[PDB]
């Protein structure tokens, strides 16, 4: 019962240091079987060794209160523990470009989990250098098998959108010189990379884009998120910088409402994401039903990246009040981008 991961390739290969990405959503699997699950790829490009490394996660779970009498009042509690997760989409600084120059692929997965079962979404980032040979590949992830299928679009360097090619150009200067351009909705997949520094003051710019009261930005997370718009000229370091907002208009990602609906809201909750904090630092909403959306997030109000794994809980991703903060690790959706095409 193999599943397919389609990849689109333009006619012209290697105009630049560009990479393509594909994804596939897998059927639910037991949560216990996702431990130590790593992709085993059969492509001609060896997977990056840093993806299979151990990344320490905080597991936040919800359960009915253990104390009798209070358990009779159907209240629920939160438990925070440290776990080790491998193969998750935790990229490092300049990993995409180094993988491009090293002919190495980046195969990671995003997991959508309720309290007991997980829906994994496998991602693969490969350079366009594999778009000329177009050698078929097989990827094994736990009990599932994925066939890497390459499709050759009728575009020189653009991305196929509604039967037409589209090229997004970089910075305002190129648009001004071209003197005319067109904007269309282009699918995009993004990953958050956390890196400490002095030029990575993320939230001082976050407050600038949208009116959010976020004081004491120095103690908050520092980093950028790199997104792939597919095709050629995909890599973007940070969006809306004016050299190359939509993600935060729909922070939850592509519309994935459960819609027959056996989903039951249990109620909101608070929990300690560092598991050693004096008080709760993150708010979540526990739920029951089919797993939906992303169960992984990162606490912003901590310079060091505090990765969050909350099976059966929905992390609070609204930064309107900056309280109980979290941000999605991965985001898939459609954004309108300027550009031009033949």
């Amino acid at each position, epitope marked *: 019962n193999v599943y397919d991961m389609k990849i689109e390739c333009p006619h012209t290969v290697s105009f630049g240091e560009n990479s393509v990405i594909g994804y596939v959503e897998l059927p639910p699997m037991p*949560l*216990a079987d*996702t*431990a130590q699950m790593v992709p085993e790829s059969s492509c001609s490009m060896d997977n990056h060794q840093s993806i299979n490394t151990i990344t320490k996660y905080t*597991q936040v*779970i919800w*359960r*009915g*209160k*253990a*104390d*009798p*009498g*209070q*358990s*009779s009042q*159907n*209240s*629920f*509690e939160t*438990v925070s*523990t440290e*776990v080790d997760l491998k193969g998750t989409c935790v990229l490092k600084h300049k990993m995409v470009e180094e993988s491009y120059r090293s002919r190495k692929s980046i195969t990671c997965y995003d997991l959508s989990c309720n*309290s*007991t*079962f997980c829906k994994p979404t496998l991602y693969m980032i490969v350079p366009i250098h594999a778009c000329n040979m177009m050698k078929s590949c097989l990827i094994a992830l736990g009990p599932y098998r994925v066939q890497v299928v390459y499709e050759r679009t009728y575009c020189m360097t653009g991305v196929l959108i509604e039967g037409k090619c589209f090229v997004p150009d970089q910075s305002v200067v190129s648009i001004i010189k071209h003197g005319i351009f067109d904007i269309a909705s282009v699918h995009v997949v993004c990953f958050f990379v956390a890196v400490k520094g002095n030029t990575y003051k993320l939230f001082e710019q976050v407050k600038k884009s949208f009116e959010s009261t976020c004081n004491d930005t120095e103690n908050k997370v520092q980093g950028y998120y790199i997104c792939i718009v597919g095709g050629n000229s995909a890599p973007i370091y940070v969006p809306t910088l004016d050299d190359f907002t939509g993600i935060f208009k729909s922070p939850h990602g592509e519309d994935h409402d459960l819609a027959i609906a*056996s*989903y*039951s809201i*249990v109620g909101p909750a608070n929990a300690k994401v560092p598991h050693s904090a004096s008080s709760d630092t993150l708010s979540l909403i526990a739920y*029951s*039903g*089919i797993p939906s959306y992303s169960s992984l997030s990162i606490l912003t109000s901590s310079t060091d990246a505090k990765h969050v794994f909350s*099976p059966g809980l929905f992390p609070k991703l609204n930064h309107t009040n900056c309280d109980k903060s979290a941000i999605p690790l991965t985001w898939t959706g459609m954004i309108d981008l300027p550009g031009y095409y033949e």
Partner: antibody
Amino acid sequence: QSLVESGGDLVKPEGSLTLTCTASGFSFSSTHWICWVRQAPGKGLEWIACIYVGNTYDSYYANWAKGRFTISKTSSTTVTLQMTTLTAADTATYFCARSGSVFGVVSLWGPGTLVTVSS
Amino acid sequence: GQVLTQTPASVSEPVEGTVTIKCQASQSINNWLSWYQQRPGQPPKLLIYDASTVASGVSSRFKGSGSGTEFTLTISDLECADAATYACQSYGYGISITDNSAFGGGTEVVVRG
């Protein structure tokens, strides 16, 4: 708040028996887990199976009881436990368990019922 | 394969004394343990959960300590009503739902008067 176990009569070897657990004056809600635990005279507690007993369905069985036992929720106050091909080693006291998570802390037990497997 | 070892099988301690029950797990559980009191012909009663928290209505004379792979249960100021059977349950959460889920062997407590 209490749990009541019914059934549990004398059953011939290789036979089948279905147990039933009932709740008294308390709705099942959606943040609870119902489980079955058995204990032979002179031996420790043994896990059997659990049910989320909510809107969504998911159940987990013990390794020894997989395929041979059958647990399912029936209504908003009752759960069942079908037992098949019972042997002499299955003669034990079967308890109904209520927990806040799967295979978790049992916040409330029941008096228990005895299943005697003898010819 | 997760195995739960509970020792000693039987213990005999006098009144006003102390009782020590050792519950050791083959696999690490991260301070997830529960202690139960089981009288004959009675449903087991939960007294200690999370290996350190006293359940509401349970006397302070019951103390639970330990973390990781080794836990102990101490009963101070022993009484005649405390003579019962005790067992430990190893419960897991999230990933460890089915990896470490087992019940203790059970210990017999006799109170010498």
